Structure 1
């Protein structure tokens, strides 16, 4: 019926092997710090990890992170993926150094590494994704539009099995990076520390005086006088009463937010994968910093 995607550990690799891929991505983050005006590639790696995981359809088990399908042209040239090709190019040299890691395993660890090296919470991660054939590549159109409202978001997230708490926890990833006109028809960052992982997104959403305006791509965005932005989907988080009390909780307690995000991000990343009972437990990688590097 629904595909079954069983996780299979890369033959003969253990924890230490994966700690090494992580340490390489980390060292590389540290080093190419000039990208996107000095934001670094942190934010674009997190976004690449969400986008390869977000094509998942809980109905027939297609899409999701398992197959590393982003490596194929169809997925790669998905208009909603515009701009991701920068996270790809960044990880290529790494893949060439550790050729035994599957794609989906690399693309997902990149997201975890970014968060943790950007001072986020530790995200437990699992190995085992296996590259599948070019024909298992999901058609374009499964990632969410940004010009919509809270019911649109609730609905969309439901296909990925995420509830309210998970959607608001994931969304605060919007503290990182920024929109770029050329990629999405949106322009501007969400906050000021856009390369440190904090609950900043929620404080802005609650504390700024936002104005609705149209941008040069002729799309509407919410503009703050501090120079921040909020897409319609972000904005929708304070329109809905269920979402807004959760926003508040997070504006109010960065810990809580970190715990909730950790859990939701892992789930997002393991959606669609069956892990045998004998599969190793999830790894918690040390940062560069905890390793003294």
Structure 2
């Protein structure tokens, strides 16, 4: 199964920078969302969930086809709460109707990471909307009540190795869990992209507790939480080494996360040899906007 990137007709870097800027301005404007976290974290989660359906064995799922727009995927219990990110992007899509849905959902994650002071994430255009029958079934996204061996095996289907897994999980510094969405609660209100997930894993005094949904999660008195799959990264000795590496090297984490997150958003896509090079968008702050 081959998905060839096809640039939206006549469009170039400046077109996509305009889309980036509209998302970034809206992120700034809609500050109240989720107790003043803003939409950044949910947009990162959205970009990950639309990509994380991918199966390297047959190239089903993945970001290319924009299939999150269809009810079967929109309504995946694993996607509960992402409707907020979709609604945020609706007016952006109306302003720029020429962008494909996969391009918009993935660009929303890039824009969110960068506007939250994260690394630059190079981004390529050319995902093309595919039909409703190409929507992957529910159940391809990961469970949170699982150990390190589950995490490791799960991510092999996305062609991610231990370093890529631990780097990607650093996005869990952002935002929070919501009981009604996932059966987990808490995490704070962070909307700045840092390596603090790793520092918190190593430095907080974690207690294994049951939440109001009767699920176990790790809580600290300082008010952080870790999912069982987050805490697995310090239970497994191979993951632990990499956690320590990122807790001690902000720049290395940024570089590794940027590579892994681009790769995640591009899995499944064939880029022609004469496709444009990846775009690196300027933040609003870099543009004086």
Length-normalised TM-score, structure 2: 0.99
Aligned to 2:65: 67
Instruction: Provide the C-alpha distance between the structure 1 equivalents of 2:24 and 2:66, rounded to a whole number of angstroms.
Output: 21
Instruction: Provide the C-alpha distance between the structure 2 equivalents of 1:267 and 1:128, rounded to a whole number of angstroms.
Output: 15
Please give the per-residue CA displacement for 1:154-206, whole angstroms capped at 9, x wherever unaligned: 00000000000000000000000000001000000xx6561000000000000
Q: Describe the SS at the equivalent of 2:160.
A: coil
Q: Describe the SS at the equivalent of 1:20.
A: helix
Equivalent pair of 1:45/1:114 in contact (CA under 8 Å):
yes
Equivalent pair of 2:178/2:185 in contact (CA under 8 Å):
yes
Q: Describe the SS at the equivalent of 2:4.
A: coil
CA displacement at 1:130 relative to structure 2 = 0.1
Equivalent pair of 2:175/2:188 in contact (CA under 8 Å):
no
Unaligned runs of 5+ in 2: none
Q: Which of 21, 24, 27 pairs up with 2:22?
A: 24
Equivalent pair of 2:188/2:223 in contact (CA under 8 Å):
no
Q: Describe the SS at the equivalent of 1:178.
A: coil
Q: Describe the SS at the equivalent of 2:27.
A: helix
Alignment root-mean-square deviation, CA: 0.7
Query: Is 1:225 aligned to 2:196, yes or no?
Result: no
Aligned to 1:34: 32
Instruction: Provide the C-alpha distance between the structure 2 equivalents of 1:69 and 1:134, rounded to a whole number of angstroms.
Output: 7
Please give the per-residue CA displacement for 1:127-166, whole angstroms capped at 9, x wherever unaligned: 0000000000000000000000000000000000000000
Instruction: Provide the C-alpha distance between the structure 2 equivalents of 1:15 and 1:231, rounded to a whole number of angstroms.
Output: 38
Query: Is 1:249 aligned to 2:269, yes or no?
Result: no
CA displacement at 1:217 relative to structure 2 = 0.4
Aligned to 1:48: 46
Length-normalised TM-score, structure 1: 0.98
Instruction: Provide the C-alpha distance between the structure 2 equivalents of 1:209 and 1:200, rounded to a whole number of angstroms.
Output: 15
Equivalent pair of 1:175/1:193 in contact (CA under 8 Å):
no
Instruction: Provide the C-alpha distance between the structure 1 equivalents of 2:219 and 2:107, rounded to a whole number of angstroms.
Output: 33
Instruction: Provide the C-alpha distance between the structure 2 equivalents of 1:193 and 1:34, rounded to a whole number of angstroms.
Output: 12
Q: Describe the SS at the equivalent of 1:279.
A: coil
